[PDB]
From Swiss-Prot, chain E:
Portion of the parent chain present: 17 to 316 of 1273
Protein name: Spike protein S1
Region (Putative superantigen): 188-209
Role according to the record: Attaches the virion to the cell membrane by interacting with host receptor, initiating the infection. The major receptor is host ACE2. When S2/S2' has been cleaved, binding to the receptor triggers direct fusion at the cell membrane. When S2/S2' has not been cleaved, binding to the receptor results in internalization of the virus by endocytosis using host TFRC and GRM2 and leading to fusion of the virion membrane with the host endosomal membrane. Alternatively, may use NRP1/NRP2 and integrin as entry receptors.
Disulphide bridges, residue numbers: 94-109, 199-209
Length: 39, 49, 97, 48, 224
């Protein structure tokens, strides 16, 4: 783990989380941000 | 991906008549009389289940 | 002498408004489109002739003031699920939600 | 499940073209029944 | 008496695309199904004027008076007379007591209205009493449908009722008929169609209409 970041994730887990794109919506309040079914 | 396609193809089978005046329940519930706006509802209700 | 031929009642008559609200669940009828949602401001550029709007799935997402020409922004009214958290009815009858 | 505040019902019209009524009234002359006369309207906020 | 000749053939490259509806849309790619001028087509560059067999929709450019219409001919039934008239671009509909040559540059009335370089474009589709009229006027540089892409923006909608099956100009003159095809349109961050594909020109512009995208990747694709 890299004690600099505020996530404390290894130099290599940071490259794996910026290369996998997303499609979730647990947002607490949310042309449309993927999440277009909620409605 | 597989999971996003599956939803977006559920929130799009809503605009489909399945042989009904329209796909807006309001419409069918005006341009039609109470004892006929039932048959044209079960066409929608059935294909959405 | 009135009459109702095959085509519509065009002539038809005056309908009233209600004034815009903005920032509050309100049911609506802008032009002839219906629905229920919060009518916030906007940021779109509805080209000089395109009234409504629609997303990557077809759902009104904006309208323009049918009589002040301003882009609105339908945003659906809240909804979700209610979950009750119980410590057990043998223990207490107190709950959280 | 939750919700609802749908209270009011914004309506849409607010600036429109009026009927040509009145144009069928305060006019000076009128037809002599032996000239019933006719003038049929169409397509305009008819204001009864 | 007739100004000049009357026929030929030229190509309609990527030209003749109108905004099919007033539903704004942004950063999207819609697959419509209206009536457009099939891409890479044949334009009967006329240049006189017989009674053109105007049929299911008709394009009509003219780069450098008005027009006419009618299932029949002179005053006897329906018609039209979009007559660009400087001061005001008038119009009208009725029997029509014009001439075999209303050279420029009558009964029951049932409608009225008024209000170097030039790429006058125009389509005159007629659907459900709403004879439609789109258009777009850019400058130019050449003489032949200056190869390019610009979509026509709806202009009028005369709610008339004339049944049209013929027409003519009243003194460029191109004239491509329209067909029932299917296209994939690209709307930019303002809702302007900045591109398009015909899903039946080539084998690659049908793979792009199944993958809904203007950029395919290596592979074998099941398309039809």
């Amino acid at each position: 783990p890299d004690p600099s970041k505020p996530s404390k994730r290894s130099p290599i887990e940071d490259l794996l989380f910026n290369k996998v794109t997303l499609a979730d919506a647990g947002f607490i309040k949310q042309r449309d941000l993927i999440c277009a079914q909620k409605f | 991906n597989h999971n996003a396609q599956a939803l977006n193809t559920l929130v799009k089978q809503l605009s489909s008549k399945f042989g009904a005046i329209s796909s807006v329940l309001n419409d069918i519930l005006s341009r039609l009389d109470p004892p006929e706006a039932e048959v044209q509802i079960d066409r929608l209700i059935t294909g959405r289940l | 002498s009135f009459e109702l031929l095959h085509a519509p009642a065009t002539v038809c008559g005056p309908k009233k408004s209600t004034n815009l609200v903005k920032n509050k669940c309100v049911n609506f009828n802008f032009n002839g489109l219906t629905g229920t949602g919060v009518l916030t401001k906007s940021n779109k550029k509805f080209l000089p002739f395109q009234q409504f709007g629609r997303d990557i799935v077809d759902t009104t997402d904006a309208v323009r003031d049918p009589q002040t020409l301003e882009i609105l922004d339908i945003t659906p009214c809240s909804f979700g699920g209610v979950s009750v958290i119980t410590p057990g009815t043998n223990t207490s009858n107190q709950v959280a939600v | 499940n939750f919700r609802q505040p749908t209270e009011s019902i914004v309506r849409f019209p607010n600036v429109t073209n009026l009927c040509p009524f009145h144009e069928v009234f305060n006019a000076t002359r009128f037809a002599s029944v032996y000239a019933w006369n006719r003038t049929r309207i169409s397509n305009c906020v008819a204001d009864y | 008496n007739l100004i000049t000749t009357t026929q030929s053939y030229t190509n309609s490259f990527t030209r003749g695309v109108y905004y099919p509806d007033k539903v704004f849309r942004s950063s999207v790619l819609h697959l419509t199904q209206d009536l457009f001028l099939p891409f890479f087509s044949n334009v009967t560059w006329f240049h006189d004027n017989p009674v053109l067999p105007f049929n299911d929709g008709v394009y009509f450019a003219s780069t450098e008076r008005g027009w006419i219409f009618g299932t029949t001919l002179d005053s006897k039934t329906q018609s039209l007379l979009i007559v660009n008239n400087a001061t005001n671009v008038f119009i009208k509909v009725c029997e029509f007591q014009f001439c075999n040559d209303p050279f420029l540059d009558a009964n029951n009335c049932t409608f009225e209205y008024v209000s170097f370089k030039n790429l006058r474009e125009f389509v005159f589709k007629n659907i459900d009493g709403y004879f439609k009229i789109y258009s777009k006027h850019t400058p130019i540089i050449g003489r032949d449908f200056p190869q390019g892409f610009s979509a026509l923006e709806p202009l009028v909608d005369l709610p008339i009722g004339i049944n049209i099956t013929r027409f003519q100009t009243l003194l460029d003159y191109y004239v491509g008929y329209l067909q029932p095809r299917t296209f994939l349109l690209k709307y930019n961050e303002n809702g302007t169609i900045t591109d398009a594909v015909d899903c039946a020109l080539d084998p690659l512009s049908e793979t792009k209409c199944t993958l809904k995208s203007f950029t395919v990747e290596k592979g074998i694709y099941q398309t039809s």
